[PDB]
Design a protein around this ligand. Structure first.
Ligand SMILES: [Ca+2]
Length: 145
């Protein structure tokens, strides 16, 4: 037994309780974890920390986020070289970033990114990967029929 929510021909499906947008399924989670613990939790559901490729994708997810919290995305720079990599292995596209003003601003250590609300706006902030925050898991949708 499994249970899907399918929307359109072809039908795009997600697990019943996940949020659906353009062939992908998302779930924001609010219990605090480090970046690596967060990714561990996502992968346990077949998922990964969310990759954000378009503004449309970000605009979709932010409507389900608590403005008091930071949410880990999948983007990580392990040695502070500016070698940002998506943990889901989507190739990093530096012409499609969404930093807050004056970010990224950590010049040392292992840095990760959170979606955070600041200055009346959702955008990216770089944060030490050992910081504890919420997260957004993302899993590719399935297709029928
Ligand atoms: Ca920062």
């Amino acid at each position: 037994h499994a249970k899907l929510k399918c929307i359109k021909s072809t039908w795009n499906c997600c697990p019943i309780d996940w949020r659906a947008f353009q062939s992908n399924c998302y779930f924001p989670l609010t219990d605090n974890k480090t970046w690596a613990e967060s990714e561990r939790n996502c992968s346990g559901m077949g998922a990964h920390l969310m990759t954000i490729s378009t503004e449309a994708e970000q605009n979709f997810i932010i409507q389900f986020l608590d403005r008091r919290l930071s949410y880990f995305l999948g983007l990580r720079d392990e040695n502070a070289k500016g070698q940002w990599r998506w943990v889901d292995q989507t190739p990093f596209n530096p012409r499609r970033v969404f930093w807050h003003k004056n970010e990224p601003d950590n010049s040392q250590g292992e840095n990760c990114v959170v979606l955070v609300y600041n200055q009346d706006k959702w955008a990216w902030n770089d944060v030490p990967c050992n910081f504890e925050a919420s997260r957004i898991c993302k899993i590719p949708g399935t297709t029928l029929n």
